[PDB]
Amino acid sequence: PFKCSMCDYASVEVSKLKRHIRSHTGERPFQCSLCSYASRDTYKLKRHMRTHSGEKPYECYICHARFTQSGTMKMHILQKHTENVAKFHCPHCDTVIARKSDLGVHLRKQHSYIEQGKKCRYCDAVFHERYALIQHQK
DNA sequence: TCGCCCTCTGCTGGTTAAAG
DNA sequence: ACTTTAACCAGCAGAGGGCG
Ligand SMILES: [Zn+2]
Ligand SMILES: [Zn+2]
Ligand SMILES: [Zn+2]
Ligand SMILES: [Zn+2]
Ligand SMILES: [Zn+2]
Structure with a gap:
């Protein structure tokens, strides 16, 4: 239990508390080399770099449209290829x-x-x- | 352990089609 | 037959958590 002093966030890992605190301090250590975007953590920078590389790792198995992020594809499948979804x-x-x-x-x-x-x-x-x-x- | 990778979440602006 | 408008949608960025 590594608790944030500023909110109710807590983690079992020191590194996760350190990452979380950058949400309070605004520190964005992981800078894109091609534009002004900078991330608080490594993952969102890599995910952003897919937009510069043109990398689209996800493909709708129904219609074969391709997507840069997995949640975008999931939402596409839910809204376009699924009936009786709760509104x-x-x-x-x-x-x-x-x-x-x-x-x-x-x-x-x-x-x-x-x-x-x-x-x-x-x-x-x-x-x-x-x-x-x-x-x-x- | 923590870099890596997953997931859930949520705003933006272009498109589109319906209302009046 | 024209404006106005707001839901639909892909796209992109927010966070928290498991694990080799
Ligand atoms: Zn906090
Ligand atoms: Zn960039
Ligand atoms: Zn599809
Ligand atoms: Zn009036
Ligand atoms: Zn309402």
Whole structure:
């Protein structure tokens, strides 16, 4: 148990605590030699270098499209070649979304606070949430 | 042990097609 | 028959954990 003093992270390996702390300090030791990207750990630099090398190690076994990362391919297979996958229902409206991160986009765009407000395009009423604005305009 | 490799996670911007 | 818009999607970068 090697505990971070700054959060609840803990590990059974000293080296993992050292890596974790760079998330607080922002130290990025592993620099790309071709662009400005730099990583906190060795793996994400190698994964990034695949984009310079053109290395695409992953191939969809159904349609043979090729991918640079494994999770990209997995998501492609889930969304394009799989039926009856559970969908994301927004709690604040009736929209249904296929991907969790797209639900995130929707929450931030439609249900977040707009400090400077937005006026209806047909009337002088002002709203501070896009969903309420669009509902009013209708 | 720790470099290596896996996985789960999550934002961005181009495309597309639907609504009004 | 045109704009506006937001989900769909590939792409890329975030982290935590097992093990030879
Ligand atoms: Zn911490
Ligand atoms: Zn680079
Ligand atoms: Zn495929
Ligand atoms: Zn919603
Ligand atoms: Zn109005």
